[PDB]
Amino acid sequence: IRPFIAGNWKMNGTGESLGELRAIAAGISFEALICVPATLLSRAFDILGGENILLGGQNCHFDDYGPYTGDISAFMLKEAGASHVIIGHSERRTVYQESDAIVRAKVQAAWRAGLVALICVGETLEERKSNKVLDVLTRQLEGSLPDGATAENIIIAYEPVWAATSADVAEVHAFIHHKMHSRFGDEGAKIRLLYGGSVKPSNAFELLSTAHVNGALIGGASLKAIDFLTICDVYRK
Amino acid sequence: IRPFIAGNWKMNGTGESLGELRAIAAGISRLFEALICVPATLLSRAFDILGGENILLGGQNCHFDDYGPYTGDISAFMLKEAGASHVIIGHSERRTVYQESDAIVRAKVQAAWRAGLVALICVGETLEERKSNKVLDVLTRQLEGSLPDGATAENIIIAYEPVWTSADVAEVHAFIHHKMHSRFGDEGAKIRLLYGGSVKPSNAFELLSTAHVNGALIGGASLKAIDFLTICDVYRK
């Protein structure tokens, strides 16, 4: 499986940030993806569109178009230059009450538009404390993933919302990998599984060396090229 | 009071739509101001073609924070830097689906001001609220809670959405105008009040000539220049 390093800028980035984005790209010139705010996507594509780095969005709506003030369609992301979109991030599941059925509908829209969906799952502190980690993941993986998923059209990120040790991560990733084989067979075994908890240059070697971790979904350490590229450099070792 | 015609494209518009946006701008290019609020993905490209023109450009929502760990959200600073001067906040499509409270709306308005945006704040009652004869009670609460201290005729515009006639509209807009004078004094009497129910070329003269109606927030009829410009033409008569 080809490793995949995804950065999520979250609610950071304007035209002033394009230099930094170029620096991330030039450091790549594994696969790498940066997911920028929707306001910046077209301008990011204008400078990076040819280059090695992949460009993504951070959420999309379930419909192709329509009366949804303040929402962005998968088609809008695609036309602005995204190839990938994060869907079901913990920051949204909570605040925007995105249920697994809502997440599945968003994934289906992403595919209609030709995007790869980077689907996030993960249990809360109360859920882990209740000894419900595998029950939550069983439900979220089933409900969030539409029928028709392939190793080409989805990538999964595990977020330990409750926080994680590399043993904790190994246990979860093995569980998720078995789930993908159970539902999607041999092709399911090729679905990339990213660790999406705290990933920093200081813990990247240990986390990315872990069985069934096929990359990372990196938040704050994706905002500066020096951090992001130092994490990417682990694959040299 | 100078009249103000705002179009809300909602979740419609890509690069392919830039010709139609230009057609709107050229049709405006004396007695009123015009604003088009495009999806966040399109804003920078809209500014690139229209930034030196008469049309105002806006966004459709913003977050409460300046920046931060808010996947899929757009800050007021991002809108401003991409070329917006205005932002729609508290539209009924979001108050319902995303449970945007009056407190949440207030915090968004405050962010808009920090970034130097004019906040186009939407209020309005549900069908159930209208059926229960609670319209004025709901507007009293929404107007108090949604507007921060510090509002001026320069930094806010209010749109009334009957979420649920000219007599209905005159009564409501009179009430809203009086509430603005009550809280903000003489300056409050200068806050523009837009009607934002179904505004079409066929009802525009009657609606826009109503006392205390200072313009409109137009949805579907803003998607095509022919419809939008026909509504604007009312100020020539």
Side-chain angles (χ1 to χ4, degrees), chain A residues 11 58 66 69-71 91 96, chain B residues 11 60 68 71-73 93 98:
Chain A
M11 190 172 82
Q58 289 177 23
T69 296
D71 270 303
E91 290 162 0
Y96 300 114
Chain B
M11 195 177 79
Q60 289 179 20
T71 299
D73 269 301
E93 287 156 4
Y98 301 112

Side-chain angles (χ1 to χ4, degrees), chain B residues 189-199 201-211:
Chain B
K190 303 171 181 185
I191 297 166
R192 299 151 281 183
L193 309 182
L194 313 189
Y195 177 71
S198 289
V199 182
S202 55
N203 56 19
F205 183 90
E206 188 176 2
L207 285 162
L208 295 172
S209 60
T210 300

Side-chain angles (χ1 to χ4, degrees), chain A residues 8 10-15 37-39 42-43 58 61 63 65-67 69-71 73 76 79 89 91-92 96, chain B residues 8 10-12 14-16 39-41 44-45 60 63 65 67-69 71-73 78 81 91 93-94 98:
Chain A
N8 177 10
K10 305 190 178 177
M11 190 172 82
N12 298 276
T14 67
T39 38
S42 187
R43 284 171 288 172
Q58 289 177 23
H61 198 260
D63 211 339
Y65 67 92
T69 296
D71 270 303
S73 74
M76 291 172 181
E79 193 272 337
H89 194 280
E91 290 162 0
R92 304 191 64 87
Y96 300 114
Chain B
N8 178 9
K10 307 184 179 182
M11 195 177 79
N12 298 276
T14 67
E16 290 93 342
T41 38
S44 76
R45 288 170 285 171
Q60 289 179 20
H63 196 261
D65 213 334
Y67 61 86
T71 299
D73 269 301
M78 287 171 188
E81 191 273 333
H91 193 280
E93 287 156 4
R94 301 191 63 85
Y98 301 112

Side-chain angles (χ1 to χ4, degrees), chain B residues 129-130 132-133 135-186 188-199 201-205:
Chain B
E129 288 163 346
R130 162 76 57 169
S132 285
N133 284 121
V135 185
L136 298 186
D137 287 350
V138 164
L139 290 175
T140 298
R141 178 179 46 74
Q142 292 191 317
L143 288 167
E144 181 65 31
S146 288
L147 278 59
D149 299 339
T152 71
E154 293 68 45
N155 71 14
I156 69 160
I157 298 173
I158 297 166
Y160 171 58
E161 291 185 87
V163 192
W164 65 253
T165 66
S166 75
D168 293 333
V169 171
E171 289 174 358
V172 166
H173 277 245
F175 179 89
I176 294 176
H177 179 70
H178 187 86
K179 290 286 175 277
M180 295 303 98
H181 178 80
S182 293
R183 184 167 177 191
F184 302 109
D186 288 348
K190 303 171 181 185
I191 297 166
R192 299 151 281 183
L193 309 182
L194 313 189
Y195 177 71
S198 289
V199 182
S202 55
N203 56 19
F205 183 90

Side-chain angles (χ1 to χ4, degrees), chain B residues 28-29 32-52 54-74:
Chain B
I28 302 314
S29 188
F32 62 92
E33 303 186 78
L35 163 72
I36 301 286
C37 302
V38 302
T41 38
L42 195 60
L43 184 56
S44 76
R45 288 170 285 171
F47 179 84
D48 288 342
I49 64 159
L50 266 61
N54 294 294
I55 197 181
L56 301 164
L57 288 179
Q60 289 179 20
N61 171 56
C62 66
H63 196 261
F64 67 80
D65 213 334
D66 296 345
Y67 61 86
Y70 314 104
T71 299
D73 269 301
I74 298 302

